[PDB]
Symmetry: C3
Subunit: 384 residues, 3 copies
């Protein structure tokens, strides 16, 4: 079957803190691994936890239960999924005021490979309904209430890490997400299987962007963005000049800031699509597979500014674009979950570590693109 | 005589954390009990403390020193005082931003049987001056600075639990409340004897509502609210339809939200009054005794919505109604405390667990009411 | 040689918590001392740290690594640098919302002898752009990321305490200050040698006020403020009446609140200046040496209100006056720090404990003032 360890359970008032298991204790001499929770200290990181899967000749996956089960970084195969933010600390949400800087205090903690920007709302901040809707919602700055590590009894010893992140407020909402990361030791991919449940007796809105962020050694001058798309448009007027070269990345560029593109992806016959970033040579990359019934739109964030400012790209499948909640409501992208109902989010991330792997991804994308022409539309779909 | 244990003393920088005493080890020979402080973990409850008096044959009383000595739950005699909020965690105030949601962040922590909504201000939020007065003030989200447990050395072994909750701000205020709960082991009642003191050299405003909340098994369709009153009026236009049936509760009702009523209570010759919620059969209930010189007004919060949304009633004696501080100042209910002066708050809460007990409460209330007519006034006293 | 202890290093995820060293363990000859870090508990002080140098027959210096290495108090020679705020706790910044009270939340934590009011911004609050610039910035409410204690192994055994306080925000800033206090056992002075560094690739504004605060036994009726100045002016209309007796303090006075004065100091042949507060008899005082190229302006805060409200004076060298950032920008005092560049802050604090030490400071100040006339300007330089 499987062994489960409950690391954190708020209903029983318990948290194991520092903890580790390893493949020697389970008596398995195949692809060695360990799973470890560490309580961090110093600065604004005081009391933050990280949980890591260390796989011999596979991926090392670091996530933070304190920060909504956000993925900090993925390393392996001479590469990584991650970037180098000026924010070096794993910031305890107790030291972040999301309302500060007119709804941009979230920037004080942003350094992750994957942040769930949701679920009660998402996107750029706005003052509306008499309140501040803060940048990218609350999931990424909510400590998990339940954290469980499961390891399969039988080969290939799949690891599942679940974390329940709650957005429970009297008179407002009771949205809770059971996040799950799955990883087979030695594999070059992992998957997320997240389930958002509306525990209230009333329907409630939700939004989510799987904000996935990649820097060197995949991002570089001449790196490319690959996706099957029916249309692409600039987020704002500043991005218009980058529309023609949407598929190619510049090297680290002073005064660039960012250019964002809103994409309507194409999917295969079973609603699966794939997006990727690959290096100039075409021998390193990262791909994200997602289901367009769950996540119908895609944001491309090209943050090719200096290495210290942040040299990174975001491939961001979502229910929404990053416009503020007022625009996402007006344009009918905000979703609704019936009382007691659940929404699933299935994503597969692959660290592409040779030319053949990049070629296969590029071939699949071409097959989905087929003879459909990419419509490059210069007019932004909204103005904030 | 009595023995005192000092669980928390910020002046000496100490906090015992996990701690317990019990009647066995104390060689107490009559009603068995234990008193336990527990440090909680998980989710937004990380570091939060609860302090519980466990009784074999009496009341089990849980309070939270992290959350201003608010009373979380009272259980005994086949019943309870409390309710089931969507907020299941004992939220550490470090994870609440009271200014968020336009001064409604307090909703993210609300699950208690008794919240002190005060003392520097209280009531619904409003932006006045250039500042946000947040929902129900700060006492309830302030960790106690001094916590002591006292047990009398001989029968009946009265237990007292004291907690100093400070609202100290340079240039603004130095209001401090020494909260105190008293419980005789085996009893069906407990009392509060709080003392607010103005430690500043200037008079300062204060407001307080003892926001006392009762759900199932007391609250149900056909449950009744009992009180001796001179007048009652709806809080807003929406409550006008419920005024004629103010004394009777509906079952859990979808789309109800809440109806609030503002009451001017009658008192006996010693300025004591009594209010209660009783079930339909009249064999379970809870009564609150309060002093109308200390708490001159009463708010009835009828939140008979769905069980998941909140099926609960508040019996809320206060110096103020729940309108914002702007309305409470305008209508002259904001009290002032002179330099060095103190204000006392004496309340007795009784868990009524048979017909005779409910009948006795109903008879005392009928005696205080006497021949005074209840004025049901249709016009709200203020508009927010 | 020298011995170093790393008490806190966020990069490695470590913090020593409770820790001590003493001069018996280090085999020191003629002067006994200890350095101790203590983790505090209770109220809003839970988890806050203090770090103290105890020197027998010298100064006892207490600072807080949790609160940006702010100096809490200095004690020795029958006197002290410090004051008695109504805020008695060492408030963990997790429990302060700087945006509360319209940007005055900082007031809930203010009790320190020296607060670094900076560095991203400083001064009184203002809502500009779209954003709240909160009172006196963020350094004083930021836990240190790296904390090091260094002690020289031979006479006179100088102690150095370094604390890295970061203001790192994606897309906004990456200002980091390596604070440093130096102290020689047995001495009546200590020094600060801080270094602010812009770790970003873009120039950034900065401001700093070294908010140094003194009460009894130095401050009293007829206490004097000494400084070599070219001009002094009041902060606002209310401070006009105190302009002529700027050098003289009143006793604790009801309804005074405060009077603030904006000074232009003179300096010596190496750009050094000296400001001091001395008692009426002139046998106790405190002086601050600073570099006028580093901190070109000086603020005198006379808060001679009651002992309970706050009987304190601030000698406040800085790059800016306490006006909001809008005024400081407009009147051209906001400094710019270039990419990779550093700014230094060298200050010497001396606890004056006899008539001749006060004599010397007043005569050293005498030499600096010379034949230059003090221009008392009745017009405030700005209106907030
Ligand atoms: Cl377990
Ligand atoms: Cl539109
Ligand atoms: Cl290859
Ligand atoms: Cl004790
Ligand atoms: Cl209305
Ligand atoms: Cl009965
Ligand atoms: Cl800015």
């Amino acid at each position: 079957g499987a062994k489960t360890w409950v690391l954190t359970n708020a209903e029983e008032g318990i948290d194991k803190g520092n903890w580790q298991i390893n493949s020697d204790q389970l008596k398995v001499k195949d692809h060695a691994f360990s799973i470890e929770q560490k309580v961090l200290h110093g600065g604004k990181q005081e009391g933050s936890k990280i949980l890591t899967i260390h796989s011999k000749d596979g991926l090392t996956i670091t996530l933070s239960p304190t920060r909504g089960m956000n993925l900090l970084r993925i390393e392996g195969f001479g590469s990584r999924m991650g970037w180098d933010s000026p924010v070096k600390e794993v910031v305890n949400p107790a030291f972040i005021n999301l309302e500060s800087r007119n709804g941009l205090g979230w920037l004080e903690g942003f350094n992750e490979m994957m942040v769930r920007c949701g679920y009660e709302w998402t996107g750029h901040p706005v003052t509306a309904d008499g309140q501040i809707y803060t940048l990218h919602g609350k999931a990424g700055n909510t400590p998990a209430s339940l954290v469980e590590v499961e390891v399969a009894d039988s080969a290939p010893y799949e690891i599942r890490i679940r974390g329940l992140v709650k957005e429970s407020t009297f008179k407002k909402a009771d949205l809770q997400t059971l996040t799950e990361l799955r990883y087979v030791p030695g594999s070059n991919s992992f998957s997320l299987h997240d389930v958002l449940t509306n525990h209230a007796d009333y329907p409630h809105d939700y939004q989510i962007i799987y904000h996935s962020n990649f820097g060197t050694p995949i991002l570089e001058e001449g790196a490319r963005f690959l996706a099957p798309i029916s249309s692409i448009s600039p987020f704002n007027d500043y991005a218009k000049s980058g529309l023609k070269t949407w598929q190619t990345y510049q090297g680290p560029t002073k005064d660039f800031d960012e250019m964002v593109f809103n994409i309507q992806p194409l999917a295969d016959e079973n609603h699966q699509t794939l997006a990727a970033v690959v290096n100039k040579a075409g021998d390193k990359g990262a791909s994200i597979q997602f289901d367009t019934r769950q996540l119908p739109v895609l944001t491309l964030w090209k943050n090719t500014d200096t290495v210290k400012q942040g040299y990174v790209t975001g491939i961001e499948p979502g229910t929404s674009y990053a416009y503020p909640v007022t625009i996402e409501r007006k344009q009918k992208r905000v979703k609704q979950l019936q009382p007691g109902a659940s929404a699933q989010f299935d994503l597969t991330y692959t660290l592409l570590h040779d030319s053949a792997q990049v070629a296969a991804v590029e071939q699949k994308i071409a097959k989905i693109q087929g003879d459909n022409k990419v419509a490059e539309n210069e007019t932004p779909i909204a103005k904030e």
